[PDB]
Antibody, heavy 217, light 217 residues
Framework: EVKLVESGGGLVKPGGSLKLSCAASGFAFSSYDMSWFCQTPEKRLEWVASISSGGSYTYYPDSVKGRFTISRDNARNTLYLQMNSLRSEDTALYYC??????????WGQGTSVTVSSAKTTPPSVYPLAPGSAAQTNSMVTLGCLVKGYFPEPVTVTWNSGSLSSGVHTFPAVLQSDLYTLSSSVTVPSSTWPSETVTCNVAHPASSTKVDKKIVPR | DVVMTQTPLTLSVTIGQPASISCKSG???????????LNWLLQRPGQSPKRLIY???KLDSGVPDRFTGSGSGTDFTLKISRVEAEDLGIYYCWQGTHFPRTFGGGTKLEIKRADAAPTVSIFPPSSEQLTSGGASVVCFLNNFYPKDINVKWKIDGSERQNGVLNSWTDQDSKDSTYSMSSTLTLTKDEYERHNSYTCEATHKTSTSPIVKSFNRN
């Protein structure tokens, strides 16, 4: 039954504002104290804010006191986190959580927040085909390099999802204040290149979708 | 804020074998009501945190009793009597006794499996990318175990660490291997001033380095 679904995360400029929401269902929302926590890019967990069942009592650590407000609408089974004066160190995955049983019992799915003055930039997508010299051949590995985009995330699939096994898509890295990621796929040397292999890349922030067919060198 | 210290940072365990994790707090976690608000949670890769233990030794009902918690005062231990595949992920202790709530730094649990050699593939910069004036050489090293591996780039025989970025996947929940991409990034002009590019790896699975190389002509 207990379900917690955050929304409202996105890219925000340093000094800007964003309001997150958490829709609760499967339990009597108004009877429970609720909290926000976040997980940083380095995977540290931190407590962000807490609020009493009836909304009367609010608590904040010093890291956010004066900048963030937590509130709830018990008519709408919804918790909120108003975030002002945002800074780059606030970049994190924000989770709502239910306080119960002398701790926290359920966590939400999280909504991602990046605070940065860097602009939304669609990716360049480049094909990774083997060098003109080969060998090894039962299987051949191909890839896409998805370079110079921001903010996160991108999605990568191969032949529109038909393929799945043999694929590795690696976490993005920061390079010139933009993200770069790679994805490899491994197929039988028989099916490539006689059959086509295409990486499909989505970058929802720039409303962009790129197909790149891998062709021999 | 109360400091929470976890030992070890890393565990590597074979299925069916026990493990334990230590949590030490900078101050006693006994609250004035006589209860000790010390908690453990698991975050599996790509999932939300899951409660394990609350009030030091109390077991979350979705968690099997092969997990137990103990301790008092400043010293606590999470024990797993026999590790199973799904135990893969980062374990955290956290305290609710003192304001602000604070978390341990996390202990990453890896599952041991049999040694597996990396599949290594090298890719010259695509034609496309050269037109942007940049050049990335990509090396994939896929499905290896253990995680210990040393990857070097050589240009015309000489080592280069400048412009290299590496990205690792999480341990696969299906085969318990790791994968990594290593990307060497030059300007087109720099790239074009050299002939030989090598991705060289050392791993316990082979008595000699794994070498993948191209010349570019």
């Amino acid at each position: 039954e207990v379900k917690l679904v955050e929304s409202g995360g996105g890219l925000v400029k340093p000094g800007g504002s964003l309001k997150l929401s958490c829709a609760a269902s499967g339990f009597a929302f108004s009877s429970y104290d609720m909290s926000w926590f976040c997980q940083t890019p380095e995977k540290r967990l931190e407590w962000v804010a807490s609020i009493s069942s009836g909304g009367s009592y609010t608590y904040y650590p010093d890291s956010v006191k004066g900048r963030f407000t937590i509130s709830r609408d018990n008519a709408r089974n919804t918790l909120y986190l108003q975030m002002n004066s945002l800074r780059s160190e606030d970049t994190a995955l924000y989770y709502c959580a239910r306080d119960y049983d002398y701790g926290v019992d359920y966590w939400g799915q999280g909504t991602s927040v990046t605070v940065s003055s860097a602009k939304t930039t669609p990716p360049s997508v480049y094909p990774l085909a083997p060098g003109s010299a080969a060998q090894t051949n039962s299987m051949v590995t191909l890839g896409c390099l998805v370079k110079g985009y921001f903010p996160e995330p991108v999605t990568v699939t191969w032949n529109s999802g038909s393929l799945s096994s043999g694929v590795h898509t690696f976490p993005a890295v920061l390079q010139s204040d933009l993200y770069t990621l790679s994805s490899s796929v491994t197929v039988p040397s028989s099916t490539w290149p006689s059959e086509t292999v295409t990486c499909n890349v989505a970058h929802p922030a720039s409303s962009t979708k790129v197909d790149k067919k891998i062709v021999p060198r | 804020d109360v400091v929470m210290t976890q030992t070890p940072l890393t565990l590597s365990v074979t299925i069916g074998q026990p493990a334990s994790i230590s949590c030490k707090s900078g101050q006693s976690l006994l609250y004035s009501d006589g209860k000790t608000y010390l908690n453990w949670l698991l975050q599996r890769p790509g999932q939300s945190p899951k409660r394990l233990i609350y009030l030091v030794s109390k077991l979350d009902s979705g968690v099997p009793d092969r997990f137990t918690g103990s301790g008092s005062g400043t010293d606590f231990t999470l024990k797993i009597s026999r590790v199973e595949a799904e135990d893969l992920g980062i374990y955290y202790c956290w305290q609710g006794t003192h304001f602000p709530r604070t978390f341990g730094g996390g202990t990453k649990l890896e599952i041991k499996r049999a040694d597996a050699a990396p599949t290594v593939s090298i890719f010259p910069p695509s034609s496309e990318q050269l037109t942007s004036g940049g050049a990335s050489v990509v090396c994939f090293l896929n499905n290896f175990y253990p995680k210990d591996i040393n990857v070097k780039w050589k240009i015309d025989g000489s080592e280069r660490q400048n412009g290299v970025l590496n990205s690792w996947t999480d341990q696969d929940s299906k085969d318990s291997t790791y994968s990594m991409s290593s990307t060497l990034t030059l300007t087109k002009d720099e790239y074009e001033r050299h002939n030989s590019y090598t991705c060289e790896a050392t791993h316990k699975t082979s008595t000699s380095p794994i070498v993948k190389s191209f010349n570019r002509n």
